[PDB]
């Protein structure tokens, strides 16, 4: 296999998904240089689980899944096994036995706009926590108390998604961050994704 893995279209995509509707790209039958990314000064997080980041280029996997979305700076800590909060609980959840890497970088230049970018959403309300790698894109009015809602927004009856408001001079904790989560999958099948 000579062809390079299409990481450019993952990391350099013009637009990223909302976290609640996080995107998944399957990577396979290709060669990828993880070290070039790890050793760059571009990322604020490059932290791996079940595998050493400095050993990634020596390994082969059956599939690599690249999940990507935007959150705000103070939420990057929630993208890890065992974490709690709105993002881990209701939006994107990693398993305890996660084998992969979490990669994040500040995206203020791209994802904020004067006047405010309000297109990136997260789920604020949900009945129960997501299971690992579960995705929820439903938009039913959430009942927060005893009175049924009958689909009517109101007191204790909340639309479940909420926009981030990304404006360029927000504090860093409230600036947008792009996140790529790589899942390294080893099946009972030949490996097709290796380093160089």
């Amino acid at each position, epitope marked *: 296999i000579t062809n390079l893995c299409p990481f450019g279209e993952v990391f350099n995509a013009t637009r990223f998904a909302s976290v609640y509707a996080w995107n998944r790209k399957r990577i396979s039958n290709c060669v990828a240089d993880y070290s070039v990314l*790890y050793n760059s*000064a*571009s*990322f*604020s*997080t*490059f*932290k*791996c*689980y079940g595998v*050493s*980041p400095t050993k990634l280029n020596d390994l082969c996997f059956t599939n690599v899944y690249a999940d990507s979305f935007v959150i705000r*700076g*103070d939420e*990057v*800590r929630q993208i*890890a096994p065992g974490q709690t909060g709105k993002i881990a609980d209701y939006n994107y959840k990693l398993p305890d036995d996660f084998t992969g*890497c*979490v990669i*994040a*970088w*500040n995206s*203020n*230049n791209l994802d904020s706009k004067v006047g405010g970018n309000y297109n990136y959403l997260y789920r604020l309300f949900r009945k129960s926590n997501l299971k690992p790698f579960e995705r929820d894109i439903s938009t039913e009015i959430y009942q927060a108390g005893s009175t049924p809602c009958n689909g009517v927004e109101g007191f204790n009856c909340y639309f479940p998604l909420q926009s981030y408001g990304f404006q360029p001079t927000n*504090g*860093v*904790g409230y600036q947008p961050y792009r996140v790529v989560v790589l899942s390294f999958e080893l099946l009972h099948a030949p490996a097709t994704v290796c380093g160089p």
Partner: nanobody, 120 residues
Framework: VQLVESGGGSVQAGGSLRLSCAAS????????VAWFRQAPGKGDERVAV????????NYADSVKGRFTISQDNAKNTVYLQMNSLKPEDTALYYC??????????????WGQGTQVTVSS
């Protein structure tokens, strides 16, 4: 734990300044503190890192030899001393603390940012 930057301002090219990244608490989970800079037209750059236990330091090539990162654990503060400033050093500078170890790095506690302006 909250991070608060100070020391921002405006100086002319060739000049010098010092930024400070003051932490309110003292978390022991902080293995490293990083200074980033943000400017239009390019991705944010991690220009300097100091490892809290040893004081070892790593710099981006863009600032090596001109910037010095250091730390004072008694004040829970990390400094960035900037000499020989150039206009291309103009940026919003912001600090972060986080994990650094065998699993990689994860700068996930954020300051607010302070502007540095270098004028010809």
């Amino acid at each position: 734990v909250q991070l608060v930057e100070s020391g921002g301002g405006s100086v002319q090219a060739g000049g010098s300044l010092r930024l400070s990244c003051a932490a309110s608490g003292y978390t022991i989970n902080t293995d490293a503190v990083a200074w980033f800079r943000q400017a239009p037209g390019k991705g944010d750059e991690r220009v300097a890192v100091i490892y809290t236990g040893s004081g070892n330091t790593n710099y981006a090539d863009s600032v090596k030899g001109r910037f010095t990162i250091s730390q004072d654990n008694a004040k829970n503060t990390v400094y960035l001393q900037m000499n020989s400033l150039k206009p291309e050093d103009t940026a919003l500078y912001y600090c972060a603390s986080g994990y650094y170890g065998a699993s990689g790095y994860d700068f996930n506690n954020w300051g607010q940012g302070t502007q540095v302006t270098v004028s010809s």
